[PDB]
Design a binder for this molecule. Structure first.
Ligand SMILES: [Os+3]
Ligand SMILES: [Os+3]
Lengths: 329, 295
C-alpha cells in the first residue's frame, strides 16, 4: 500500500512564513511533500468574523468537520477539492485540486485542536515562542531591510492573549515534540536579546518515537561542553536534559542555552547527544550549516528544528518500511 | 627485576580497605612516626609538636625507603606511642608493595620522587602546625579525598549527609583520572529519576576540570547517601575510567564491610576507587598482577 504519512505543525508564524517548514523542505524536498495551510478551512471570511465578533483563533471561525473529512480522504488516497482562503482580500476563493502525496504536512493554528484530526496524525510539532523573543526577532529583521513593522506585532501579541491561551496553547499537551524558545539564563542583564534558551520537550510512550537524550536516559543532567578540549567565549554554551511532567504526561526535556560561534562547537555538542536519529555523524551540523542565513541558525532554535525533522523522517521510515523523500541537487 | 612499588598516604579505615584489596602478605605498612628524631620528652624540651619537621628525621626516612625500593633489608626504629620512647630497630624486608603512612610522607622533596602513587585524606591547638606543615602536602598528592558538609539539605542540622570530592592530579603518567560522561568538561548529574527511586534528599554527582594548588586537576564529587545496592551500582555503572576489572567491583568491595564509617557515602566509594587507581599504577609498573586478599 502506497501509504500517506500525516504531519501536524502548530504555530503562530503564519502560513509559508516559518523557517521550520523551509528546513523540512530542505530535508524532504517539495516534490513528494505538499504543505496545507489550515487557514483554508475558515468557516467565516474576514467580514464574517467581524460580524460574529470573533478572531481567526476562535474555533467558531474554523470548519473542523470539513478539515477532518478532507484530511481523512487524503490519507485514504483520494483527491480533494479544498477551499483557498485569500489573505489579501479576506475572501474564500473557489476550491483547489490537491492529490495525495508521500508526506502531507498540515500547518496552522489548530492542527491539534480537534480530537478526530489528532488521531489521523502520525507526528506533530508545536512551536512555542516566548513573546519577548518573537518581538526581539521582529526588530532584528526590521533593522536589516528597513521595514519598521514591529509595533503591529506588539499590538497583535497583547490583544491575542485571551484567545491564544484559550484555544492555541493547550495543543502543546497533544504535541509529540514542543520546541520552546525563551530568553537566556546565562547573562544577568540581557539587553541584546540575542542569546536564546531552547527546550525540546519530547513526549514519552509514543510508539515509533524514541526521544533524544544526553548521557543517561531518564536521569537529570546539566552539562557545559566548554573546558579543556573546547574553548568558548562568554557566556558559552550549556545543555540540560531530564525527565519532567508536561500537561500531565511524562516527557523528556532536552535543552540548549547559548550560541554556537563555529563548527567545532556544533559538532562537539552533536557528537555527545544520543538517539538524535542522524544517519551519519555530523548530519545535524551539516544540515544546520546548509543555510546559515536562516534565523536560529547558530543556536538551539535551528538545532532542534533540524533534530525534529529527523524524528519525522524516522517516523515516516518506520510507517512505510521505505526511505523518506529527499531534496534534489 | 622483582620491582618494589611505593605508596604514600597522608592524613584509618582507608588502610583497612587497602588491606582488603591487596592483602597483608605482600603489602607491609610503615608508620612514619617511627622516624621521630625526638621522643615525647624531647619534643616537650624543644617546644615542638610531632607535626613540626624538626621532630622528624627525613634523612633516615629517605635512606631506608630508598634502600627498601632498591631491594635491601632495613633496620628501622620503632616509636612506642604508649611510653613515648624510641625502641630498638625492627627488621623490615622489601615487599611487592610498601605503604608509608603518617603526617609527612609528602613533605620531603627526596621522598616524593621515590613514591609511585600518593593520597592525602582531608576529612584547635594543632591548627598552626597543621596549616604550616601538613596541609601543603595536598599540592603534591596524586589524589586528594576531600570531605565536607552537604549542599542538598538547606540549613543542615544533623550533619550526617556528606559531600565528598576526589581531586585527581592531571599529567601524572600512568594515572588516568576517573570522570563522568565527558572528560575535561563540567557536569552536574542526578541519577534519581525514572529508573532509580531515591528518598530525600537523594544523590547528586559533579565532575569538572579545576585548578588546585596551581595545578590542573579533575574533580569528581558525590553528595548524598546510598540507601541500597541499586543506587550504588547505578552510580558505578555510569562512571568512566574507574579502573574496575569488572562491572560492580566498587559496590562489591564497598559492601564487603558495611560496618566501616563512610560505607554508605562518597567517603568509602572514593577510598575504594583510590585503591583501584593504586592497583592500576602497580600493574603498569610491574607488568604483573597486583597482590590480592585471600579467601
Ligand atoms: Os516578518
Ligand atoms: Os550538503
Amino acid at each position: 500500500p502506497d501509504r500517506v504519512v500525516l504531519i501536524g505543525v502548530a504555530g503562530d508564524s503564519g502560513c509559508g512564513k516559518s523557517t521550520f517548514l523551509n528546513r523540512l523542505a530542505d530535508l524532504f524536498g517539495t516534490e513528494l511533500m505538499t504543505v496545507i495551510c489550515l487557514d483554508d478551512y475558515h468557516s467565516l471570511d474576514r467580514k464574517g468574523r467581524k460580524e460574529a465578533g470573533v478572531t481567526a483563533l476562535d474555533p467558531r471561525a474554523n470548519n473542523f468537520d470539513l478539515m477532518y473529512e478532507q484530511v481523512k480522504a487524503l490519507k485514504n488516497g483520494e483527491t480533494i477539492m479544498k477551499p483557498i482562503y485569500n489573505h489579501e482580500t479576506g475572501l474564500i476563493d473557489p476550491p483547489e485540486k490537491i492529490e495525495p502525496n508521500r508526506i502531507i504536512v498540515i500547518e496552522g493554528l489548530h492542527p491539534l485542536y480537534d480530537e478526530r484530526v489528532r488521531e489521523l496524525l502520525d507526528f506533530s510539532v508545536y512551536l512555542d515562542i516566548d513573546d519577548e523573543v518573537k518581538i526581539a526577532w521582529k526588530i532584528q529583521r526590521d533593522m536589516a531591510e528597513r521595514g519598521h513593522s514591529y509595533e503591529d506585532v506588539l499590538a497583535s501579541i497583547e490583544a491575542r492573549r485571551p484567545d491564544f491561551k484559550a484555544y492555541i496553547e493547550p495543543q502543546r499537551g497533544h504535541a509529540d515534540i514542543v520546541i520552546r524558545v525563551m530568553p537566556t539564563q546565562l547573562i544577568p542583564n540581557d539587553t541584546e536579546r540575542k542569546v536564546l534558551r531552547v527546550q525540546l520537550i519530547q513526549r514519552e510512550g509514543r510508539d515509533g518515537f524514541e526521544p533524544a537524550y544526553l548521557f543517561d536516559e531518564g536521569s537529570t543532567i546539566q552539562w557545559t561542553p566548554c573546558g579543556r578540549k573546547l574553548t568558548c567565549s562568554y557566556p558559552g554554551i550549556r545543555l540540560a536534559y531530564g525527565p519532567d511532567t508536561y500537561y500531565g504526561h511524562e516527557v523528556s526535556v532536552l535543552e540548549v542555552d547559548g550560541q554556537f560561534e563555529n563548527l567545532e562547537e556544533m559538532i562537539y555538542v552533536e557528537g555527545h547527544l544520543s538517539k538524535t536519529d542522524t544517519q551519519y555523524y555530523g548530519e545535524l551540523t551539516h544540515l544546520l550549516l546548509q543555510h546559515k542565513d536562516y534565523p536560529g541558525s547558530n543556536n538551539g532554535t535551528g538545532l532542534f528544528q533540524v533534530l525534529t525533522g529527523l524524528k519525522m523522517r524516522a517516523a515516516y521510515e518506520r510507517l512505510t518500511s521505505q526511505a523518506a523523500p529527499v531534496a534534489a541537487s
